[PDB]
Curated annotation (Swiss-Prot), chains A, B, C:
Xref: PROSITE patterns: CHAPERONINS_CPN60
Positions carrying N6-succinyllysine: 33, 50, 116, 276, 320, 389
Main location group: cytoplasm
Entry keywords, A to Z: Acetylation, ATP-binding, Chaperone, Cytoplasm, Isomerase, Nucleotide-binding
EC number: 5.6.1.7
Taxonomic classification: Bacteria, Pseudomonadati, Pseudomonadota, Gammaproteobacteria, Enterobacterales
Record-given protein name: Chaperonin GroEL
CDD domains cross-referenced by the UniProt entry: GroEL
Record family assignment: Belongs to the chaperonin (HSP60) family.
Length: 524, 524, 524
């Protein structure tokens, strides 16, 4: 409707207060002793979470100027989650520290643009320092420790995650689903498998649940559905002559083909079962080539140079056996050459490094894992539905944290790494005095994540910080055991990527935020 | 609806206040030390920008009379942006200065219409003076300096821009896109390239990512899509006889043609890949003639005296090789005569000098750059999305500023050129005394852009101006280094076109603005 | 629904105040020193104008009784604009003067109807006096002076207008459009030209921009579109036999005819280009005969006794050459007899004196100018859109003023003519005393336009008027030079038609308005 305009200090104060509301809610969930935050949903049962990004999204303020401040700080928490999926609560804390000190500096009469220059320069230097401190994470023990720390110090989570990564490999795919029982369960899938059931329920080779096992079967792939387009008899009889079972993958199969097929399988003429292709025209067609090559078969290009009849038994691929159920199809092992398997994988490398990243790489990797690696699913056990999402959420954070730790390495936890690097940068200077103050402000803000953890434990945050600063290297305070020692030796690890990202995202938004002279928003 | 009307001073005061609100928000973003303004969007996250035109657009006032004043001053900032895309904040300042002094003169009991004439006459003389001061900008260093100054004194921006203009040439096309990394990147395209990928993924000549390389290929252009429109075999056969690869450009190619084509390419009969034309029929058809002429080929006029089959292999154009991927088609070098290349370019000159200007010239120039010059794309690197728009926006201003500086020349920055010209015009007189005062008022307003920069630096605006006036030529104060010297030697440059345009747009609206006796608006 | 009613003095007072509000806004824009009025639009940006009629339209009052008075006075300004397009502000002033004095007489206890008769009788006598004072405006200098005076003393406007009328002639057509630059530009069209481009882009005779020049072409006119309607070969070949270019005018031409036509032209068999007729069926059909007769050709009546094939080469019209572009078609000179040209013009005289007048005459004259005279278009230069409408609006008023001055002559400006005629009518008497007072009141009101001009100049209106009355003939006060002299010799002219119309429209509504005894309106 009609706008409201605020200038200078009045606008900054409202912005800050809004930021404080967002940050105060987020801070309580930081650390081993962190406390849960409950979000109200009209959708159904209210949510209880310790995840800072989840809390940031739900916070909106009635005061438009305060709300604007909160909305801008919201992004840093959201970006951290996007970059690594962990460290979001810590990133918000840094934004709080930087903003509060920065605004205070602005009040002092210092130029905001220069203060931003100081902060950014300090950030660039701090990032390089983090890289030097970062050490490779490769062994199972280190991987388990990062998972355990991410999941609010839950040993079972780290243990299970480490086993998963070990078993599936570097390019394996790991996901998490709600478990049927209280106990946490790990499921590992071997071979080539997809989520498609069988069109003909009637043909079950032996096990119940609709499990079809074909021994030494031939595999058929096609680009069209079959109704009265039954004609394929010379292909079918060729298989009948062989006396071997047939597996069919295509857009669809209709009852006319299925009806004759069922009698043929029961009578003993041929043992044949069929299943639908993966899903969408481009989606299913793309995944057909790998199935055929893996089994040594040839895909029938209805669209291109091939016809339904036009195909020889030799075209069909070979596999040891397959498993089929109402919702899933599995192939134990297609027989094909490694050079062909690797060649399929080699062409995937361009696919792997793609501009799109999100929703590109994720599906793409899954094909890759199926082609030569393995797929792992983790089940989460909880007595109640609300307990279940909290438990599962933390597990995902640990899952993402391990992925980040492996690729970029790890640094000491408890916020020790940021405070330790700050001492190193104590001699860093900018173009002018305002920049020097901005640099100093950023270093000052680095300390805050460490002290929030201590604050949440009900202990003097400044006191612990002074003792930690006094020490050297990886020395720090363990909130869980309320004592000082080597953070790395205690199993407390922070992946380098999340630590780096938290600092950079917090600083980027904070630098711009502190420079705001005037704000424009709608009237109440 | 019911109307509210104000007469004389009451209407002017309300108008002035509206103007002041709009201008005050705009002023803080002027200079090396300028401060950012944050605009609230319901659309998504809030926007932070130093661009005055962006800020002017978003300002609306609750008071209808004040709002009307702001809306009228909004146009000067917007028109300046349309003219050259830079100096919008500076133009707003001049409007502020002129209006405030002009209204004061009106209060004094002076006829407003005469004051407007005085201002306009002074402006006309000032413009001529600017032209005399303006010197040609031809070297890379000068171009870089204007880009660097435009982009809030960022040396890298000016450097990257200058390299681009040098590489592409005078008629080359330069654009800016968001970069994947944190580093600014420059991309240069050589030869003829377009944004359409290949219909047949199946034929890849060698490199991965769908890259197709045809060696000494023949190029075919058509005005019709092909389904069962397979016929053209004798043209195809002729190419097969030749033993050379074929490139196809048309509205579309269907699977039937693609199907036979894929097998033919695989068996080695012919190596042929097809790519879709540019897009819109008036669009792609227009761009077809140049492709053909460049490669020495003939476009097939399905519409006119030509037929699908009717065409000899000789009709087809030739090129060294082409590069094709999923979303892009490139031709290394078609072999055609310069007279044909230039002739296509010569006919473009009418196209260049077009009344529409906006949109018509932009697409048109892009064809031109591809035909004989080069095309450059600049990527912008930033830690966050909000940082990215700010960073990218400034780069565009510098890009536009360089374009303006090359064509109309440059003048000394820091507002020195307007203040320096004002001293020259101190002896300018109008028809009567009221006009003389109007002239004097305009000269007085010229000083303001200089002093706003100083004001934003926390220094006495009048003090710096007095010393600057005392000097001669290009002598002035450098806000960034807080010292006095030759503005041109330092590297602070203002394109003549933006300087001229800012002054003229500000004055045009302001003269009308100060002559308002009565205002009419809807009730609150 | 329910209404509020008022009687006598209470109703008249409310009416008067409404009138005063409307008139006060209008008065400030009267004279060389007149001040601008700004109107708020929800359409887009606000409008700034000195045109009284524009201001009157936008004024509406919250008080229903006051609003009713304003609505009635609005019409006089609007009717004056319709009659001549100028003097609307002056007419409103007369209504103000007459109404205020008339109401005062009603207050005195005199019959209003008699006052009306007195006013009307004085008006009738005043009109006759104006006719006697009116002298013919025939020279370029007098025309320029009226244009310049109308355009708020802008010499360039009068100069450009006079040149336009001189060049085009008495029956020529002059229009005004927004210019492409900051300078006023005049465009004159010689010969026969229309706003239709070519259907076949392919045939361009020589100059770039789609320009087609046919040398000694034959012109063909038709009543239907051509698709498969290609047949007309013997007509076409007859031209081919001749070896001359062909110009085609019809409802439409389709690609079948155009495709063959392009190839025939390309090899030099025939040089033929085709364009579309003027517009709507009746519109294009009406203007076809003149084109044919002008070029000596015959129109093909598909509708009547003629057929597509049925037409000889001799039936085709002949012209020296034609010019064609994408949006326009021009013929240098068709060869036809003057008696036929004049005969076409002679039949137009019935068309010229038409009851419809508005729209009918405007389009009709344009045909007339094209047939034997010329067409002129004036472009208006400005830096901003708002500046552009004000500048253009005044130019149109001057254009209308010159048109009015030529046909009915001119009288001395500055309001001298009305005040001078009033002295003459000082001895005029009615049937009774109340009528005598009404007459005297009207004469009294005549003085007001003169004094508003002086009032707007900040000088004693009564003092100037007393000296003006004291003088003889064309003696008067020049507001622009602040001195007394002969108004005609100083170049200040008022077209007789606007002066007469202003007085008559003002008085007609005012006479009825002063006689109102009771008003009825809706409740607040
Ligand atoms: N038991 C612990 N002792 C010391 N530090 C811990 C302990 N548990 C977690 N931390 C640290 O505190 C940080 C915040 O924990 P977390 O809730 O996971 O926040 P994120 O959600 O990671 O901001 C960790 O990244 C880690 O370095
Ligand atoms: N460091 C500087 N010292 C002196 N003058 C400067 C400096 N930097 C920029 N300027 C000048 O002040 C003007 C305003 O800067 P800018 O923010 O780009 O505003 P526009 O957006 O150009 O109004 C410039 O066009 C230039 O002439
Ligand atoms: N410079 C001048 N000196 C004296 N009288 C003038 C001058 N300019 C215009 N006038 C007169 O005052 C009248 C009003 O001017 P104008 O603004 O054009 O009103 P209209 O809009 O014509 O009522 C004119 O018609 C003319 O007679
Ligand atoms: Mg965590
Ligand atoms: Mg700029
Ligand atoms: Mg006028």
């Amino acid at each position: 409707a009609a706008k409201d305009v605020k200038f200078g200090n009045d606008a900054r104060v409202k912005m800050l207060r809004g930021v404080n509301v967002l940050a105060d809610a987020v801070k309580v969930t930081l650390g081993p002793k962190g406390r849960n935050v409950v979000l109200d949903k009209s959708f159904g049962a209210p949510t209880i979470t310790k995840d800072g990004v989840s809390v940031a999204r739900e916070i909106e303020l009635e005061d438009k100027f305060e709300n604007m401040g909160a909305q801008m700080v919201k992004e840093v928490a959201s970006k951290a989650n996007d970059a690594a999926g962990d460290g979001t609560t810590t990133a918000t804390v840094l934004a709080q520290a930087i903003i509060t000190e920065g605004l205070k500096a602005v009040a002092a009469g210092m130029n905001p643009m220069d203060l931003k220059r100081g902060i950014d320069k300090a950030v660039t230097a701090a990032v390089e320092e983090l890289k030097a401190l970062s050490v490779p994470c490769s062994d199972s023990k280190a991987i388990a420790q990062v998972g355990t720390i991410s999941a609010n110090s839950d040993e079972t989570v780290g243990k299970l995650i480490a086993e998963a990564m070990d078993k599936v490999g570097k390019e394996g795919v790991i996901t998490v689903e709600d478990g049927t029982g209280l106990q946490d369960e790990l499921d590992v899938v071997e071979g080539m498998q997809f989520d498609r059931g069988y069109l003909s329920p009637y043909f079950i080779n032996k096990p119940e649940t609709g499990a079809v096992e074909l021994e030494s079967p031939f595999i058929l792939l096609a680009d069209k559905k079959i109704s009265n387009i039954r004609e394929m008899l010379p292909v079918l009889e060729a298989v009948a002559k062989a006396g071997k079972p047939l597996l069919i993958i295509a857009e669809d199969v209709e009852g006319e083909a299925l009806a004759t097929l069922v009698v043929n399988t029961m009578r003993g003429i041929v043992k044949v079962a069929a299943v639908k292709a993966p899903g969408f025209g481009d989606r299913r067609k793309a995944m057909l080539q790998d199935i055929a090559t893996l089994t040594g078969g040839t895909v029938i290009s209805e669209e291109i140079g091939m016809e339904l009849e036009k195909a020889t038994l030799e075209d069909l691929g070979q596999a040891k056996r397959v498993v089929i159920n109402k919702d899933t199809t599995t192939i134990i092992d297609g027989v094909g050459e490694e050079a062909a398997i690797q060649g399929r994988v080699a062409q995937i490398r361009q696919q792997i490094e793609e501009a799109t990243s999100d929703y590109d790489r994720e599906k793409l990797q899954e094909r890759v894992a199926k082609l030569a690696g393995g797929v792992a699913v983790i089940k989460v056990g909880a007595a109640t539905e609300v307990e279940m999402k909290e438990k599962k959420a933390r597990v995902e954070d640990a899952l993402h944290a391990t992925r980040a730790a492996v690729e970029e390495g790890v640094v000491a936890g408890g916020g020790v790494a940021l405070i330790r690097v700050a001492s190193k940068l104590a001699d860093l200077r900018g173009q002018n005095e305002d920049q020097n103050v901005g640099i100093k402000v950023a270093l000052r803000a680095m300390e805050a994540p460490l002290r929030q953890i201590v604050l949440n434990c009900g202990e003097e945050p400044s006191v612990v910080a002074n003792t930690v600063k006094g020490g050297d290297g990886n020395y720090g305070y363990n909130a869980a055991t309320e004592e000082y020692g080597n953070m790395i030796d205690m199993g407390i690890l922070d992946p380098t990527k999340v630590t780096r990202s938290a600092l950079q995202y917090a600083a980027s938004v904070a630098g711009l935020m502190i420079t705001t002279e005037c704000m424009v928003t709608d009237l109440p």
